């Protein structure tokens, strides 16, 4: 059923699974028109489909042309997400297809179930977890590729960089969620933390800086503080 605090280690077992987050698929800027009314302008979006055991991220870029001439875009966005996830699954060899897909928002359940009717043995699950994947567009290299896209495109990344050479997938996921939660709470502060020391760089083929083990401990501490303070900065404690 639903994935929650009690069945957390299931994410790092050897059954292939994917998280799907649709919060960045349909993105708009809201603005005034010459007549003083309000309109929206769409901007490029993305589906965030992540294997939490390996770090493989299938980033399907959603170009604004997909919305042209369509109505009820926030409803369409869920079905488009389900269509693209289904297409990804069909594109993978049988032995790479997931056994479960976990959607971060419950409104994705019926769209995905209907698009996956051909795969009766792939379980579609919700989660009670407050997963921070909306903050993926605060990762500079991810935001850059989404905004530059001029057509539909899938781009593959490992969201863990090379961390799995040194740490387990449980620990890598915990670091990822702490970083992403930090970026969601105060993006400026979080980004200041990550880049303050110019001698630690981001490799061309990575998303995050090349911290030593000891430097990740300090970084992780700084991110908890940022969120620790921000659990009062708005909520006064």
């Amino acid at each position: 059923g639903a994935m929650n605090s009690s069945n957390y280690a299931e994410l790092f077992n050897n059954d292939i699974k994917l998280f799907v987050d649709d919060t960045n698929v349909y993105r708009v800027t809201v603005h005034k028109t010459f007549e003083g009314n309000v309109a929206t302008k769409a901007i490029n979006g993305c589906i965030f489909t992540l294997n939490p055991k390996t770090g493989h991220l299938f980033l399907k870029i959603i170009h604004t042309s997909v919305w042209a001439g369509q109505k009820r875009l926030s409803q369409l966005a869920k079905w488009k997400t389900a269509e693209e996830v289904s297409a990804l699954v069909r594109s993978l060899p049988k032995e790479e297809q997931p056994k479960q897909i976990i959607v971060t928002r419950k409104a994705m359940l019926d769209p995905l179930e209907v698009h996956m009717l051909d795969f009766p043995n792939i379980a579609i699950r919700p989660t009670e977890l407050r997963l921070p994947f909306s903050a993926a567009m605060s990762i500079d290299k991810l935001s850059d590729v989404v905004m530059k896209a001029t057509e539909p495109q899938m781009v593959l990344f490992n969201i863990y960089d090379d961390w799995l050479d040194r740490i387990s997938s449980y620990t890598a996921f915990s670091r990822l969620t702490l970083l992403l939660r930090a970026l969601k709470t105060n993006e400026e502060s979080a980004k200041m933390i990550l880049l303050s020391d110019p001698t630690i760089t981001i490799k061309s083929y990575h998303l995050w800086p090349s911290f030593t083990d000891e430097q990740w401990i300090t970084i992780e501490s700084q991110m908890r503080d940022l969120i620790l303070t921000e659990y009062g900065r708005k909520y006064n404690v």
Binding site: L76, W79, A82, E83, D110, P111, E113, V114, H115, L117, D118
Partner: protein, 300 residues
């Protein structure tokens, strides 16, 4: 006007005949029901005084044979049977009528309730849903499960209603996933009406028979089927005008007839609120919406 004689009444029982019902005491000199209108199906149903568990009964049409009821002390229930000897049967009935040992089907002349609840219900279709081909009448009880309930366990004793499943390949055309799920017209008109039922009369007949089994026996799978067949229409943007008008009348009489005190278990809040207030047909069921709002405004 036809008659269903009873050999006797050895156990105390509430007997129903269509929407009517009367109590018979243990060993009371009761010998059946006369003046049954010809031209409709009918249901004769039972609830024992000592075990209200298991309401059960028989669907029948007196044009198809001479039927009577006889209690079986081994299986412990009132059983319907056919008498093939027509002269023996006429003789029995005439004796019981002369001794005035039969209740009269108590139809008020102004009253079209039974017709309105069974307009599209045919015995031939009942017998395909309830499979027992050696008999011309059909037994149903509170506990019998439906084919679809079994899929999710004895098949000979099942209600073979047409399976409806909105998240199924039958319901969803490849490449029309969002379209077919949010507007079920394809599934209603092509798959179900043109393909399976053939015409709307047979669809309405199964819908009416499911409601009646839900109401008279508390059969949960029948209630599920009734609501699914309503929801499939209401969730279709394109429905023939005559079908919507007839559906409004069908549901009006069903809601009118439902016992006020059974609404909590026989009416699904989600389906009805969706059908009357959100669906494509939210404005096409005026009669049904008015009776629902005046009789069960809590549910809504």
């Amino acid at each position: 006007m036809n008659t269903v004689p009873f050999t006797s009444a050895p156990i105390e029982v509430t007997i129903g005949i269509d929407q009517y019902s009367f109590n018979v005491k243990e060993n009371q000199p009761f010998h059946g029901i006369k003046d049954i209108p010809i031209g409709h199906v009918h249901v004769i149903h039972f609830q024992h005084a000592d075990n209200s568990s298991m309401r059960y009964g028989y669907w029948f049409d007196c044009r198809m044979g001479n039927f009577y009821i006889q209690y079986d002390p081994k299986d412990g229930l009132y059983k319907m049977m056919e008498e093939r000897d027509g002269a023996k049967f006429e003789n029995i009935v005439h004796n019981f009528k002369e001794r005035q040992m039969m209740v009269s089907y108590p139809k008020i002349d102004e009253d079209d309730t039974w017709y309105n609840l069974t307009e599209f219900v045919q015995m031939d279709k009942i017998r395909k849903i309830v499979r027992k081909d050696e008999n011309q009448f059909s037994y149903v009880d509170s506990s019998m499960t439906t084919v679809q309930e079994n899929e999710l366990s004895d098949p000979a004793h099942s209600l073979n209603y047409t399976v409806i499943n909105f998240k199924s390949r039958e319901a969803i055309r490849p490449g029309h996933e969002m379209e077919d799920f949010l507007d079920k017209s394809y599934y209603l008109n092509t798959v179900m009406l043109q393909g399976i039922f053939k015409n709307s009369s047979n669809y309405f007949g199964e819908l009416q028979f499911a409601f009646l089994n839900a109401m008279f026996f508390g059969n949960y799978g029948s209630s599920l089927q009734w609501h699914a067949m309503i929801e499939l229409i209401c969730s279709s943007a394109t429905v023939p005008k005559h079908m919507l008008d007839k559906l409004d009348e069908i549901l009006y009489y069903q809601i009118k007839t439902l016992p006020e005190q059974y609404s909590d278990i026989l009416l699904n809040e989600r389906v009805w609120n969706i059908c009357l207030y959100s669906s494509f047909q939210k404005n096409s069921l005026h009669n049904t919406e008015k009776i629902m709002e005046n009789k069960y405004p809590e549910l809504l």
